[PDB]
Amino acid sequence: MCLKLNLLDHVFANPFMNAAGVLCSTEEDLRCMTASSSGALVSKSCTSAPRDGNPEPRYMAFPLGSINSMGLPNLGFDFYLKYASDLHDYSKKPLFLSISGLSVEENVAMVRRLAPVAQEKGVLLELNLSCPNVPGKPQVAYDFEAMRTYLQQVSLAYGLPFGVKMPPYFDIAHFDTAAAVLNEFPLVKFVTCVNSVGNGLVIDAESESVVIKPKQGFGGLGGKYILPTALANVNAFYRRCPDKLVFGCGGVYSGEDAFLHILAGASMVQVGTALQEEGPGIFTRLEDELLEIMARKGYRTLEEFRGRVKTIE
Amino acid sequence: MCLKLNLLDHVFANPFMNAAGVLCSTEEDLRCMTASSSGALVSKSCTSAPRDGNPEPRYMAFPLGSINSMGLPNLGFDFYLKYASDLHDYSKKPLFLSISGLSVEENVAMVRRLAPVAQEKGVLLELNLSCPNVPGKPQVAYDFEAMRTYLQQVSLAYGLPFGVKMPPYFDIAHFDTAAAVLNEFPLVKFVTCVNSVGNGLVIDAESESVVIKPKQGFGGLGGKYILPTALANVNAFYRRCPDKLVFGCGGVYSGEDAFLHILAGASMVQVGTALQEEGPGIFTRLEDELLEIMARKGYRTLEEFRGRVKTIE
Ligand SMILES: Cc1cc2nc3c(=O)[nH]c(=O)nc-3n(C[C@H](O)[C@H](O)[C@H](O)COP(=O)(O)O)c2cc1C
Ligand SMILES: Cc1cc2nc3c(=O)[nH]c(=O)nc-3n(C[C@H](O)[C@H](O)[C@H](O)COP(=O)(O)O)c2cc1C
Ligand SMILES: O=C(O)c1[nH]c(=O)[nH]c(=O)c1CCc1ccccc1
Ligand SMILES: O=C(O)c1[nH]c(=O)[nH]c(=O)c1CCc1ccccc1
Numbered sequence A, B: 001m002c003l004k005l006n007l008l009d010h011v012f013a014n015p016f017m018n019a020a021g022v023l024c025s026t027e028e029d030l031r032c033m034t035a036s037s038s039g040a041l042v043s044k045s046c047t048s049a050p051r052d053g054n055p056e057p058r059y060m061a062f063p064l065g066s067i068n069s070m071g072l073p074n075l076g077f078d079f080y081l082k083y084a085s086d087l088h089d090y091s092k093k094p095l096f097l098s099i100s101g102l103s104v105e106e107n108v109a110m111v112r113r114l115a116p117v118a119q120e121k122g123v124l125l126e127l128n129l130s131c132p133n134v135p136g137k138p139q140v141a142y143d144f145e146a147m148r149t150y151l152q153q154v155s156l157a158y159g160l161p162f163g164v165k166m167p168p169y170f171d172i173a174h175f176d177t178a179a180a181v182l183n184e185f186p187l188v189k190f191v192t193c194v195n196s197v198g199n200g201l202v203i204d205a206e207s208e209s210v211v212i213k214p215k216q217g218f219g220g221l222g223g224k225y226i227l228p229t230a231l232a233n234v235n236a237f238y239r240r241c242p243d244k245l246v247f248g249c250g251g252v253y254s255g256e257d258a259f260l261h262i263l264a265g266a267s268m269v270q271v272g273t274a275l276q277e278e279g280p281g282i283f284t285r286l287e288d289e290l291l292e293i294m295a296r297k298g299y300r301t302l303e304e305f306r307g308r309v310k311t312i313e
Helices: A027-035 A077-087 A104-121 A144-158 A172-182 A224-240 A255-264 A273-278 A282-297 B027-035 B077-087 B104-121 B144-158 B172-183 B224-240 B255-264 B273-278 B282-297
Strands: A005-007 A010-012 A016-018 A059-062 A065-068 A095-099 A124-128 A162-166 A188-193 A197-201 A218-222 A245-249 A266-271 B005-007 B010-012 B016-018 B041-046 B059-062 B065-068 B095-099 B124-128 B162-166 B188-193 B197-201 B218-222 B245-249 B266-271
Touching: A005 A266, A016 A282, A027 A077, A059 A273, A065 A224, A065 A273, A077 A095, A077 A104, A095 A104, A104 A124, A104 A144, A124 A144, A144 A162, A144 A172, A172 A224, A188 A224, A188 A266, A197 A224, A197 B224, A218 A224, A218 B224, A224 A245, A224 A255, A224 B197, A224 B218, A224 B224, A245 A255, A255 A266, A255 A282, A266 A273, A266 A282, A273 A282, B005 B266, B016 B041, B016 B282, B027 B041, B027 B077, B041 B077, B059 B273, B065 B224, B065 B273, B077 B095, B077 B104, B095 B104, B104 B124, B104 B144, B124 B144, B144 B162, B144 B172, B162 B245, B172 B224, B188 B224, B188 B266, B197 B224, B218 B224, B224 B245, B224 B255, B245 B255, B255 B266, B255 B282, B266 B273, B266 B282, B273 B282
Parallel strands: A016 A266, A095 A124, A124 A162, A162 A188, A188 A245, A245 A266, B016 B266, B041 B095, B095 B124, B124 B162, B162 B188, B188 B245, B245 B266
Antiparallel strands: A005 A010, A059 A065, A065 A218, A197 A218, B005 B010, B059 B065, B065 B218, B197 B218
């Protein structure tokens, strides 16, 4: 009957927050997410300098979900750090800051500056391993040695508990390798599964055209298309990383979808496409709907069912 | 107006066929696919010996698609070779035979034996590369060195044009690398994109349980979930393999979905989940619906629009 929880030395009114990138780029957006009923908020992944991002149109949504190739538009790390150190009202809810530098050095340079603000104000770091395509090498989370370098360097530079935003994997050996990398780093205290399902292509039959301008129409998919992919990643890393938290992201449109993420192992549940489409009112509905399912089942706490998805035999 | 194609030295009344695995395991199944209005059929991916596959339930479907961990149940190579050599009526439509040996040596042994029947009767080989190799390693087509080995060995042992069935990829680096491997092999004349989107997890909220028994509920996804992933892969290989055909598979439930595949580059268009759910009557419906879109647009043949998806500016 209340959905409050405690994680990472912080108190949360409920497990919901925006997904990085959605409703979180400008001061106005971050004030809007803080005024909402969400339990937390995360800022737009940032780079050391500001970015315009890719040409428009760069996001489109449809009944089954969304496609985007935003290009990491952001107001620059100095802005997000300033929001964290001077503007955010911590009495309202916790703040996560997402960083997405284009090299290890850039990520290390941002985290060294974020550390004392984390100590003083309690902002939390979500390190985004996804990045614009560089011909000739894979995304960082898809190159396990690069991933290990990033986490070794960030962990050294930051020195405090943080989390990592992961793209989906689709192969059980990949789950085993990625979770073994993550388990080398004791400061990685949460894993957020998942970022968009990479490089889909939506085509409009009437116009015979792709629907976004960058990358010949290819972009990451979110929303209903990706819920079972998201639940599989959440559960695969919940099972493999027993000393970490898993934050679930992907496909959440209802309190039933949140319930499924929590059954698979999610501690917080992030909302991307559905929030972009419905606006911040969605958080009161998701809370009501999750409490309604809990009540029908007799559950009084999230702990009673987190990670307790049943297998057959 | 017409749906006819002539490719790989065969004539097809229309581009539709089953996806491997669906309606194609027994003699009864293959006679049913032959009696349908599809333009071709493919047999179930086989191994040297018969397999019972995994325990049930191992396939389930829902409004947005399906999940399966079948375990490669099949009647064994000798049965499908007999069907191709002695039973199929080639005056009705062309036959593809899919193989999925559990090692390069098993595939080599099958294709050596298939070769003389392919030469005499015109059966076409589809080699499934989205298939287990050594457990704890990724599936073959996610291990580029293994994939190259499989292709070198099968190309030497078989010596005739064949095609390959590919898992989806999600990273531009992988589209680049995979297409470069395929383009090393001139006998690979068609590339079928895509197999299921691997290791998703469907969870039923009422029962709090996964819905298939093997693999703790993890399985490959088909259907509406995967259409933009399928289209991205069809187009990515269509652009990168200009000397090969691309066949599309994933998410086809209507003539409009088939039209989008074909705009992305697809020659043949395969139907898995929707055919499993609706039965072979789907082919008359897909042909009617694709001809209606062609009529409205004034297209008289498939080559007028195949691969002609527009990009923005
Ligand atoms: C418009 C847009 C911008 C996004 N930007 C980011 C980002 O800056 N950093 C990040 O970690 N993920 C980003 N994402 C990914 C989302 O955080 C989320 O992982 C993905 O959309 C899946 O969740 P959903 O199904 O709720 O949309 C973005 C997604 C969208 C739709
Ligand atoms: C029950 C079932 C069995 C399958 N078995 C095979 C197989 O033996 N070989 C293979 O190449 N693909 C197999 N697949 C994958 C399908 O061929 C197809 O690639 C996938 O289902 C996506 O197409 P769809 O969205 O139309 O279902 C199977 C799919 C299903 C649902
Ligand atoms: O800003 C984006 O395009 C973006 N969109 C996503 O769905 N997830 C992300 O993490 C990002 C920022 C990193 C990124 C990823 C792919 C292409 C460009 C930037
Ligand atoms: O028989 C299968 O489970 C199967 N299902 C698919 O959706 N696609 C396939 O290619 C196969 C056969 C290969 C496979 C894949 C994963 C585990 C075992 C066999």
